[PDB]
């Protein structure tokens, strides 16, 4: 008796098609919006996606009342899910992030496989013995595609007479593909490459959602009739309702070991020699090593690097995100952080791996590791509108600008030993960057007389570098190797570059930059966020070739690109804080020790003391 497993929003249920009139048994309850379902029969596992909890979860069918979270981040509308029972992998689609992703069965080693030309991806079906995956897309260009389960050889197999392709399944016995179209009111079948397409049933399908198969019978769920229907897989005859009055039928499978035929795993017993993911592949040797999202596979084709070498770090008002710069997909991963209300400026310390960011609603400077763990408050008093922040990775100090207080201030990196460095002639201070090797800080002011200014790292010898043809200089970035500084101006709508002494000024970008805010340089590239275009973009600093990194993301703010671990440059503050009891503030002419309020330097020029009454 073919058992049918289906998702039902608040629960997952099992019904036997033989006695379909009977009450369906509840497999898992307490769910919110369970949508996609699949299983690993040999492992006794049932998986489901929940689109309100934004999670994929699993349970063991034998035991009871133990729901295991598998994927709980990075999901918005995970509408389709498929288990690779041969290679032991999990695949899913997401129609809001526009991605197809793969992971191990426990959710580890997640990798985004496809991120382009996905609009409303939905159903996904696997042929692990042939290394091919199939999925539907009911979006602007509706289609059925096929690709390697390693992400290779992507091909459109059906692109005509298609509109809402909601359901998709495979017949492993006859090597056939079946799908249901909820607009064109039919179920069709074809070979695995799309050829010899044939109509199975036509007209009795108000709103089919998911389709499955067992022996010579197709089974599908229908959103408008709230039921599971069935017909003969060759002729469409004998159409009938198996099970009715279902609250909200979603994905469905024939729950059987025979629907997951056993074959040799090409990965063997050594995971193919792959350090991380061993994915089924449709070409000899029929596996392919892969790496987590953003991570490069080395030359041997087997061993992953240790994480991304370079990251783009984003503040985005209500969250922070990181994007690897190592791979072409530019997947933004949201950091797991608490109480992010209005994050604005961001920087990063590669020595300890701390991101630092400002927030003018929390009114605090905070830091964390690149995944959101280790999160700590750094500065909480007299924070008002801190629109710029910079890490001094050499002297281990933290700088910020605040247009709510009209100051530039410095602390140690953990927020202690605070000193006001600039407290006059700041109207709208914003971006701030540091050159510890040379002894300078630079900052922008977008007030009524806009400026780019320079001072020593103690705020002394203040000088205006640029005060003409500026308006809203929001972004600032040094090119340490080339002796240049770049800026983005949201009023003149320009990205400009000049030597750090103010010579050689010239316009780099002039078009389609209506409102830069975030702004950073790494290697050959300048990156920015644009408040009006709602995009992250970059330009090659010599060729001026532009690339869109992310489009249509609201609430973009500050941006910093960085090597994750490597730092360059030094000065005498790096050695025992210069001997300074409190702050060591380097200048081109030599370091100056400094003190928080109420302390004074004594005659050794190093030690701060509260002076006697």
């Amino acid at each position: 008796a073919p058992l049918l497993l289906y998702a039902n929003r608040r629960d997952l249920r099992l019904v036997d098609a033989t006695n379909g009139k009977e009450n369906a048994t509840i497999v898992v309850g307490g769910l919110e919006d369970a949508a996609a379902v699949d299983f690993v029969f040999s492992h006794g596992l049932i998986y489901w996606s929940d689109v309100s909890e934004e999670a994929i979860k699993r349970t063991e069918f034998n035991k009871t009342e133990s729901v295991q979270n598998v994927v709980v981040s990075g999901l918005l509308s995970p509408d389709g899910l498929a288990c690779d029972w041969l290679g032991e992998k999990l695949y899913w689609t997401d129609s809001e992030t526009n991605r197809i992703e793969v992971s191990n069965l426990d959710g580890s080693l997640r990798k985004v496989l496809f991120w382009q030309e996905l609009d409303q991806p939905r159903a996904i079906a696997l042929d692990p013995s042939s290394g091919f995956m199939y999925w539907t897309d009911w979006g602007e260009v509706p289609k059925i595609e096929r690709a390697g389960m390693d992400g290779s050889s992507r091909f459109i197999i059906i692109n005509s007479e298609i509109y809402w392709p909601n359901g998709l399944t495979l017949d492993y016995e006859e090597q056939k593909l079946y799908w249901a179209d909820a607009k064109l009111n039919f179920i069709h079948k074809s070979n695995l490459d799309g050829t010899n397409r044939q109509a199975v049933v036509k007209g009795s399908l108000p709103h089919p959602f998911a389709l499955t198969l067992f022996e010579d019978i197709l089974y599908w769920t229908d959103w408008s009739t709230h039921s599971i229907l069935a017909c003969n897989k060759y002729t469409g005859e004998g159409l009938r309702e198996i099970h009715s009055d279902i609250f909200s039928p979603m994905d469905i499978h024939a729950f059987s070991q025979q629907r997951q035929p056993n074959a040799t795993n090409p990965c063997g017993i050594d995971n193919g020699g792959c350090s991380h993911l061993c994915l089924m592949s449709p070409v000899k040797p029929f596996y392919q090593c892969a790496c987590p999202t953003g991570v490069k596979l080395l030359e041997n084709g087997k061993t992953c690097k240790d994480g991304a070498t370079e990251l783009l770090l984003l503040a985005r008002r209500t969250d922070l995100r990181r994007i690897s710069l190592d791979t072409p997909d530019f997947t933004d991963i949201v950091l797991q952080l608490e109480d992010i209300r209005h994050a604005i400026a961001i920087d990063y310390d590669p020595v300890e791996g701390y991101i630092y960011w400002t927030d003018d609603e929390v009114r605090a400077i905070r830091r964390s590791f690149i995944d959101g763990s280790g999160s700590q408050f750094v500065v909480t008093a007299q924070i008002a509108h801190p629109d710029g922040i910079a890490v001094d990775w050499v002297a281990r100090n933290l700088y910020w600008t605040d247009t709510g207080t009209d100051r530039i201030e410095v602390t140690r990196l953990n927020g202690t030993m605070r000193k006001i460095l600039i407290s006059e002639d700041l109207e709208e201070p914003r971006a701030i960057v540091l050159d510890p090797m040379v002894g300078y800080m630079y900052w922008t002011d977008w007030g009524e007389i806009p400026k780019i200014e320079r001072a020593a790292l103690d705020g002394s010898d203040r000088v205006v570098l640029v005060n003409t043809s500026l308006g809203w200089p929001n972004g600032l970035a040094l090119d340490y190797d080339e002796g240049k500084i770049y800026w983005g101006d949201a009023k003149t709508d320009k990205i400009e570059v000049m030597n750090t002494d103010g010579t050689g000024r010239r316009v780099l970008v002039e078009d389609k930059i209506p409102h830069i805010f975030g702004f950073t340089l790494l290697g050959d590239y300048v990156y920015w966020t644009d408040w009006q275009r709602r995009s992250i973009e970059r330009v090659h600093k010599r060729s001026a070739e532009r690339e869109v990194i992310i489009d249509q993301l609201p609430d973009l703010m500050g941006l910093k690109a960085t090597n994750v671990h490597r730092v360059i440059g030094s000065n005498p503050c790096a050695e025992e804080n210069g001997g300074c009891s409190h702050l060591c503030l380097y200048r081109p002419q030599g370091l100056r020790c400094a003190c928080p309020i109420g302390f004074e330097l004594i005659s050794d020029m190093k030690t701060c003391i509260v002076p006697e009454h």
Partner: antibody, heavy 127, light 110 residues
Framework: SEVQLVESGGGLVQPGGSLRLSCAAS????????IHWVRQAPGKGLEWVGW????????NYADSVKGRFTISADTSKNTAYLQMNSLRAEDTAVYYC???????????????????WGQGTLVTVSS | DPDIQMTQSPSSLSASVGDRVTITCRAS??????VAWYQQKPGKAPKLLIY???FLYSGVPSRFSGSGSGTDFTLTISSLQPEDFATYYC?????????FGQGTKVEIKR
């Protein structure tokens, strides 16, 4: 480009009589939406009457109107209709049409969230 | 199946300009977060304020907010304005038929 829903057809009708309301839609893809009728008796609250999904013409109705009211749609005119037969005094109300939010085929379905409402048309059933 | 009953409270209230106003809506069945709130000015069609229990609809001022899940839902106006005189309705968007609370009439005290 603005979403608009323009009702017409209301008026006075004797009990037992019939009336057809129209809801002319513009500014969105008609067939990707639920179109609802919702009514409000004088001084009272909101009561859902029924919906149609124009992509295939499927409908649902409130038990209080079942069998007497029929909803239909004409995709070529981007118009929905409420055919009201065997009208009763207690059918007196301002009749609104309203668009369900989101896409009819989406998994995260907001189709019962009524994000744009027409101005309403008054139906009075009286002798 | 029984229609889902939405019970709003209070039926009417009066508050000063600048007051925080909270309206409650209780569902007779668990409806997850599938709750919407509307504002109805006299002689006008309802306008959507909140959907999915807490999501602010585009264009709606930020003084409106919503919260809750399961059966207990609230609408908050954090600083009442003279133009906020209206009847406010909750509605479950969870299943058919959509059903509405009986409304809360908000008056401005002066």
């Amino acid at each position: 480009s603005e979403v608009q829903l323009v009702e017409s057809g209301g008026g006075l009708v004797q009990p037992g009589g019939s009336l057809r309301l129209s809801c002319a839609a513009s500014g969105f893809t008609f067939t990707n939406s639920y179109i609802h009728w919702v009514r409000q008796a004088p001084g009272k609250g909101l009561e859902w009457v029924g919906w149609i999904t124009p992509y295939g013409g499927y409908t649902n109705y409130a038990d209080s109107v079942k069998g007497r009211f029929t909803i239909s749609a004409d995709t070529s005119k981007n118009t929905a209709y409420l055919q009201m037969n065997s009208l009763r005094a207690e059918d007196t109300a301002v009749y609104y049409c309203a668009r369900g939010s989101g896409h009819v085929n989406a998994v995260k379905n907001y189709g019962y969230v009524m994000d744009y409402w027409g101005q309403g048309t008054l139906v009075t059933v009286s002798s | 199946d029984p229609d889902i009953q939405m019970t709003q409270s209070p039926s009417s209230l009066s508050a000063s300009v600048g007051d925080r106003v909270t309206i409650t809506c209780r569902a007779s069945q668990d409806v997850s977060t599938a709750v919407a709130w509307y504002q109805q000015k006299p002689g006008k069609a309802p306008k959507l304020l909140i959907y999915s229990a807490s999501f602010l609809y585009s264009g709606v001022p930020s003084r409106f907010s919503g919260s809750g899940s399961g059966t207990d839902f609230t609408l908050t106006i954090s600083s009442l304005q003279p133009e906020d005189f209206a009847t406010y309705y909750c509605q479950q968007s969870y299943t058919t038929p959509p059903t509405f609370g009986q409304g809360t009439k908000v008056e401005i005290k002066r």
